[PDB]
Every structure is written in C-alpha cells, then in structure tokens.
C-alpha cells in the first residue's frame, strides 16, 4: 500500500514477502507485522529488522547473543535502521521509520533475528 506494507510471519518460519519496495516520495515507511498460526514467542517468535545487507550478519549474531528477554536483538544496535519487537502467534507489532535513513546505491535487508530464523526469514528492501 502507500508508504506501508503488512507482513506475516507464520508457524513454518516464513514471511509472506521477500521483497519490499519503498517509494522514494515517502517521508517515512511503515511495516505492520502479524503472526498467523498458534505457536508462541519462545518457540516461533518473529520480528522484522532492517539493516544494510553488509550489516545483517553482525545484527543477527549479536541478536542471538542478546537472549530471548531482549527479543534476540542487541539493544541500541547502531546498525539496526528500524525494527519491531519479537512476537508470537496472534500478536501484532509495527514500526515506522524515516525514509531519509535510506540511500540509493545501498542494499538493504530485512530479516528476523530469532535463532536460526534468518536463513529463511529474510528479504530485500529497496528504495525506488
Ligand atoms: Hg522468526
Ligand atoms: Hg544476510
């Protein structure tokens, strides 16, 4: 939709998109995350985390080490452009971020930092 997208993470460790386009005219962009299924956060938690592609691995690694009580995301990580909280089934979280934090000629990735999820739960985010 305009300057916004709705995203689902399911019980099979899947997002329902692997590619997000952000319209350059947008002043900010919003992601609304939900979690179909019936499994809880500790088992099948999802978040939506944005970083440059170059920074993704560092964020994933430091997030795992941060623990479940930190939503598997390092607090105040300067590499995380925007993020939701970790959610289980039946829950919702959203994030709005300034589009000025993105540039052209930079590859962005979105992913989930729950342990082992990012191998499957990841995609591209592009400003155009
Ligand atoms: Hg996940
Ligand atoms: Hg990556």
UniProtKB/Swiss-Prot annotation:
Pfam families, per database record: Copper-bind
Molecular functions (GO terms): copper ion binding; electron transfer activity; identical protein binding; transition metal ion binding; zinc ion binding
GO cellular component terms attached to this protein's record: periplasmic space; plasma membrane
Keyword set includes Signal: yes
Disulfide bonds: 3-26
Domain (Plastocyanin-like) ranges: 1-128
Alphabetical list of CDD domains matching this protein: Azurin
InterPro entries linked to this entry: Azurin (IPR014068), BlueCu_1 (IPR000923), BlueCu_1_BS (IPR028871), Cu-binding_ET (IPR050845), Cupredoxin (IPR008972)
Subcellular location: Periplasm
Residues involved in Cu cation binding: 46, 112, 117, 121
Keyword entries, A-Z: Copper, Disulfide bond, Electron transport, Metal-binding, Periplasm, Signal, Transport
Function as written in the Swiss-Prot or TrEMBL entry: Transfers electrons from cytochrome c551 to cytochrome oxidase.
The name this protein goes by in its record: Azurin
């Amino acid at each position: 939709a305009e300057c916004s997208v709705d995203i689902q993470g399911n019980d099979q460790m899947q997002f329902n998109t692997n590619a997000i386009t952000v319209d350059k005219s947008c002043k900010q962009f919003t992601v609304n995350l939900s979690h179909p299924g019936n499994l809880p956060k500790n088992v099948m938690g999802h978040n939506w985390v944005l970083s440059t592609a170059a920074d993704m691995q560092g964020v994933v690694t430091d997030g795992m080490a941060s623990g479940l009580d930190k939503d598997y995301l390092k607090p105040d990580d300067s590499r995380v452009i925007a993020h939701t909280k970790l959610i289980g089934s039946g829950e919702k979280d959203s994030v709005t971020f300034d589009v000025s934090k993105l540039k052209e000629g930079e590859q962005y990735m979105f992913f989930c930092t729950f342990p082992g999820h990012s191998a499957l739960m990841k995609g591209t985010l592009t400003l155009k």
